[PDB]
Each structure stands twice: as structure tokens, then as C-alpha cells.
Enzyme design. Structure first.
Site, PDB file in Angstrom:
ATOM      1  N   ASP A   1      -6.064  -6.673   9.692  1.00 60.06           N
ATOM      2  CA  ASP A   1      -8.029  -5.621   9.675  1.00 60.06           C
ATOM      3  C   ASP A   1      -8.731  -6.443   9.452  1.00 60.06           C
ATOM      4  OD1 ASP A   1      -7.028  -3.631   6.821  1.00 60.06           O
ATOM      5  OD2 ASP A   1      -6.675  -6.057   7.336  1.00 60.06           O
TER       6      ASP A   1
ATOM      7  N   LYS B   1       0.715  -1.171  -0.301  1.00 54.52           N
ATOM      8  CA  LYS B   1      -0.371   0.607  -0.191  1.00 54.52           C
ATOM      9  C   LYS B   1       0.387   0.924   0.221  1.00 54.52           C
ATOM     10  CE  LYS B   1      -2.273  -1.566   3.376  1.00 54.52           C
ATOM     11  NZ  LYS B   1      -3.212  -1.843   4.524  1.00 54.52           N
TER      12      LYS B   1
HETATM   13  O1  LIG Z   1      -6.138  -3.095   4.838  1.00 55.54           O
HETATM   14  C1  LIG Z   1      -6.234  -4.165   3.792  1.00 55.54           C
HETATM   15  C2  LIG Z   1      -5.475  -4.691   3.622  1.00 55.54           C
HETATM   16  O2  LIG Z   1      -4.630  -4.131   2.632  1.00 55.54           O
HETATM   17  C3  LIG Z   1      -3.056  -4.519   2.370  1.00 55.54           C
HETATM   18  O3  LIG Z   1      -3.347  -6.503   1.179  1.00 55.54           O
HETATM   19  C4  LIG Z   1      -2.706  -5.480   3.211  1.00 55.54           C
HETATM   20  O4  LIG Z   1      -1.345  -6.263   3.025  1.00 55.54           O
HETATM   21  C5  LIG Z   1      -3.336  -6.561   4.121  1.00 55.54           C
HETATM   22  O5  LIG Z   1      -2.466  -6.710   5.219  1.00 55.54           O
HETATM   23  C6  LIG Z   1      -4.176  -5.957   4.478  1.00 55.54           C
HETATM   24  O6  LIG Z   1      -5.521  -5.964   5.587  1.00 55.54           O
END
Ligand SMILES: OC[C@H]1O[C@H](O)[C@H](O)[C@@H](O)[C@@H]1O
Ligand SMILES: Cc1csc(Nc2ncccc2OCc2ccccc2)n1
Length: 448
Positions: free
Chosen positions: A192, A156
Site C-alpha cells: 500500500d 497487524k
Molecule cells: O498498511 C500499512 C503497513 O502496515 C504494516 O506495517 C505492514 O507490514 C506494511 O506492509 C503496511 O504497508
């Protein structure tokens, strides 16, 4: 049709989605077996949150949430009802993430975090107390246990040096000490997706899947312990963080990638990674639109062929514009203002084209994502002696919540792909905070 020819490129037929669904399933299985878990693109990371926990520990818990654009700290209270335990944020505070905290080291990053944790403590007079602390950390993590795990690699757009490979919890503590200011018993660390799922369980015991569709996109579900080879045991179930955003990192989506997907990837903080995610996540949706529009202008089909100074900069077209644009009631005033702020003077048809471009991208995302969820749910289905498998999915994320149509397109498409399945979707009210506390409250009846 000259525009409809370009935009038709985002369409995916039912057969294309099924292929994608079948492929995600093949990768989920690979990430789960000891022999392929290492080079598997869909990591399928054991989270250690288990099927039947011993007992909770009522009381106030401190919860952290790092992974969004705004680090957050909050106090949540856990109690006990007939259902199970209840939870509720009672105090919260958000803190913008500085530039100097993102470029430096994880050291500085967690230091900045350390401050915010203290500033929160001052304002709510409680620094003198030491409560359990739930850490919702939104990145791929290889857990050794509920309170220990290393960061496989940022996603991200996070850069913090020397963070990968190390213990996240440790580093969190290695910073609480460089303070002395306060003391926190960092009990649990969760993704999350998982926190969201957990937060909905007490509402719906049938909730065994957690899904995040926000800046990023990922999911977690309850797996049969005997399929989680990476973890000793065959009794019960363990939640597994699929980290499906990395799907396609081994070339599983190459036949579907468009020139725009390539450009977005080539210019991202992590070239060659999180490809599936770069088709859905809000960190990229807007940029996908910007690239679609730009192609339109270079083919003299939009804005007379003249693109603004801003329309040509990266990230100028925010995912929230895609949403707003798709909310225009037909009078184009919404679409016009968005473009106006971007330095354009669109015509009636210019607005209808931009509108069509957004629908094409967000619709692709809604469908592509539906393939993954169906992949997860059908796999779970293949372990249940029932006619109609009822299952609930806890969900969260700006795209999924605030986009005017994503939700419906997504639901319809998931249902088509999941026969004999009665899927129920619940949105998480403060899923992270409440999720971490609820998990920490169970790991706490072990470390306190
Ligand atoms: O936040 C939403 C997702 O974003 C990205 O895919 C992160 O690598 C993942 O761990 C997280 O759950
Ligand atoms: C090792 C560990 C930490 S927290 C937990 N389990 C649970 N924590 C909170 C709520 C519920 C928990 O397990 C029950 C359950 C979870 C998901 C789906 C069905 C049941 N296990």
C-alpha cells in the site's frame, strides 16, 4: 503535576528524535547490503516497481486491496494524458473479514476472497470478462518480481495458517481456479505504501516516497539501483518497501520503550515484532491510551480509582476515540459521551486528564513517525546535487488523515529534522486501487 509526571514520560526531545532518525538510517543501510539484509530489522524489500517504465496499457483494471479491516475490490480505468496516465475508480465494493476466514488457512482466506471477487462480478455484470488484476497486499513481501513474492510474516493481527513463506499471487490464483467462475490475469502485487506513492506521481512527478499511517505504519521510497544490492543492476531507481514498522525489533528503541509499550507488545498477535509500528499505528494507539488511563486509576488519580468493566478489557478504547477526544471543543461533551459509552461517569477534570493522555500518546506517535520520514528523506538527500532538494510524499491512513492534530505535529517535526529540504505532502485519493491499476498497466504491456 502528579499526572503531568506520568504523562511527561511520553515526551521526546529534539535530540532523542535525531538519535532515532540517525538509527533508522543505519538500519535502512543494513537492510540494503547483501551481508546484513538477512538479520536486518528494517527489511528494505525490493518492490520491482522501476524508475523509468517502458509504456502503459490503457483500459479498465481490476484492483484488490487486502490488509485493512475491510477487504476491497474495485474497477479502475487507466488512460493517457500529457503528464502521464490517469486513473479513476469507477466501481467499488467492501467486504467485512469473517472470524472463520482469519483463523482458518490462507486457503480459506483466499477462498472467501475469491467469493467477494465473484459477488462483485455479479452485481456489476462483468464475470464473463477477464481483465488485468492489481493486487495491493499490505504485508511484508519478498518479491522475486513485480508479480511474484512470498509473505515473510503477517502483521497487524492476521493469523491465516500456512500463508507465510508461500507465494501470495500464486495462492490468489490457487483460489481463482477453485472457482472456474471467472478468470483473472494477476499481473502485479504491490504494498500500500507503493501504490499510494504511484497514485500521486501522475499528479506530482516529484513524488518519490509513499507513506501509510493507518492501522499500521510504513513507508517506501525510490532508491538508486546500485544501492539495492539484493537486485542486479545499477542503472535507474527501484522503489523499496522499507517495512520500517519492524524498526526496533533488534533493540534499537529499547531506551524509549515505556511500560505501556511492553504490555501492548506482550499481549499482541506478534510479540517482539513491529515495535516502531506499535508506537504509531492505530491498531495500537487506542490500546496505549487504555493502558495509560488504567495506570492513572490505579494511582487513584482518575475515576476515583474505579475503572469500568469495559475500560479493563483490551481494545475497548478504540483509536477513533483518541481522535474524537482530541476534537472536543472544550465543552467536554465529546469526551464525556466517549467515556459514558465505556461505562464511566467522568468529572470535568477526569475529561481533561483523558484528553491529556491522548495528546501525549498521539503526539509521541507523530514525533516518532517524523523521525522515520526524516530518516528516509535525508538518506535520499545524500544522492542529489542540489541546494534545496524538493520532494513530495504521498500519504494515506486514518490516523494521519482523521486525527485532528497528528498531521501538523508531524509536518512541523519532519521539517525541523529536514534542513535544505522542501517537502510537499499529498494525500492519496483512492491510492491503493488507482495505484495497483497504474502499476499493473505497466506490467501488462509485458504480460499482455
Ligand atoms: O498498511 C500499512 C503497513 O502496515 C504494516 O506495517 C505492514 O507490514 C506494511 O506492509 C503496511 O504497508
Ligand atoms: C516494473 C514496473 C511496474 S510499474 C513501474 N513503474 C511505474 N509505474 C507507474 C507509474 C510510474 C512508474 O515509474 C515512474 C516513476 C515512479 C515513481 C517515481 C518516479 C517515477 N515499473
Amino acid at each position: 503535576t502528579l499526572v503531568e509526571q506520568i504523562l511527561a514520560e511520553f515526551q521526546l526531545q529534539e535530540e532523542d528524535l535525531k538519535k532515532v532518525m540517525r538509527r533508522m538510517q543505519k538500519e535502512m543501510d543494513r537492510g540494503l547490503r547483501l551481508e546484513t539484509h538477512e538479520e536486518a530489522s528494517v527489511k528494505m524489500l525490493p518492490t520491482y516497481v522501476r524508475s523509468t517504465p517502458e509504456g502503459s496499457e490503457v483500459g479498465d483494471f481490476l484492483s484488490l486491496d487486502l490488509g485493512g479491516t475491510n477487504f476491497r475490490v474495485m474497477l479502475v480505468k487507466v488512460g493517457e494524458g500529457e503528464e502521464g496516465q490517469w486513473s479513476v475508480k469507477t466501481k467499488h465494493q467492501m467486504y467485512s473479514i469473517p472470524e472463520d476466514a482469519m483463523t482458518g488457512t490462507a486457503e480459506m482466506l483466499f477462498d472467501y476472497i475469491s467469493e467477494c471477487i465473484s459477488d462483485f462480478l455479479d452485481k456489476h455484470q462483468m464475470k464473463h470478462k477477464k481483465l488485468p488484476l492489481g493486487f495491493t497486499f499490505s504485508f511484508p513481501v519478498r518479491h522475486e518480481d513485480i508479480d511474484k513474492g512470498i509473505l515473510l510474516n503477517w502483521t497487524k493481527g492476521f493469523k491465516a495458517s500456512g500463508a507465510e513463506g508461500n507465494n501470495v499471487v500464486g495462492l490468489l490464483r490457487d483460489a481463482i481456479k477453485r472457482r472456474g467462475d471467472f478468470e483473472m490475469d494477476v499481473v502485479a502485487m504491490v504494498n500500500d505504501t507503493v501504490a499510494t506513492m504511484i497514485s500521486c506521481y501522475y499528479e506530482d512527478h516529484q513524488c518519490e516516497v509513499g507513506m501509510i499511517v493507518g492501522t499500521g505504519c510504513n513507508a517506501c521510497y525510490m532508491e538508486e539501483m546500485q544501492n539495492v544490492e539484493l537486485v542486479e543492476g545499477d542503472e535507474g531507481r527501484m522503489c523499496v518497501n522499507t517495512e520500517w514498522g519492524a524498526f526496533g525489533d533488534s533493540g534499537e528503541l529499547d531506551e524509549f520503550l515505556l511500560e505501556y509499550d511492553r504490555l501492548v507488545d506482550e499481549s499482541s498477535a506478534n510479540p517482539g515484532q513491529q515495535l516502531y509500528e506499535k508506537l504509531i499505528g492505530g491498531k495500537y494507539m487506542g490500546e496505549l491510551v487504555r493502558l495509560v488511563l488504567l495506570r492513572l486509576v490505579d494511582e487513584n488519580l482518575l475515576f476515583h480509582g474505579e475503572a469500568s468493566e469495559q475500560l479493563r478489557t483490551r481494545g475497548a478504547f478504540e483509536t477513533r476515540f483518541v481522535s474524537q477526544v482530541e476534537s472536543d471543543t472544550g465543552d467536554r461533551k465529546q469526551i464525556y459521551n466517549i467515556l459514558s459509552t465505556l461505562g464511566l461517569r467522568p468529572s470535568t477534570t477526569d475529561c481533561d486528564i483523558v484528553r491529556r493522555a491522548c495528546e501525549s500518546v498521539s503526539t509521541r506517535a507523530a514525533h516518532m513517525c517524523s523521525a522515520g520520514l526524516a530518516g528516509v528523506i535525508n538518506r535520499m538527500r545524500e544522492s542529489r546535487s542540489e541546494d534545496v532538494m524538493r520532494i513530495t510524499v504521498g500519504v494515506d491512513g486514518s490516523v494521519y488523515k482523521l486525527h485532528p492534530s497528528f498531521k501538523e505535529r508531524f509536518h512541523a517535526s519532519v521539517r525541523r529534522l529536514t534542513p535544505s529540504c522542501e517537502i510537499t505532502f499529498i494525500e492519496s485519493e483512492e491510492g491503493s486501487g488507482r495505484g495497483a491499476a497504474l502499476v499493473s498497466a505497466v506490467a501488462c504491456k509485458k504480460a499482455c
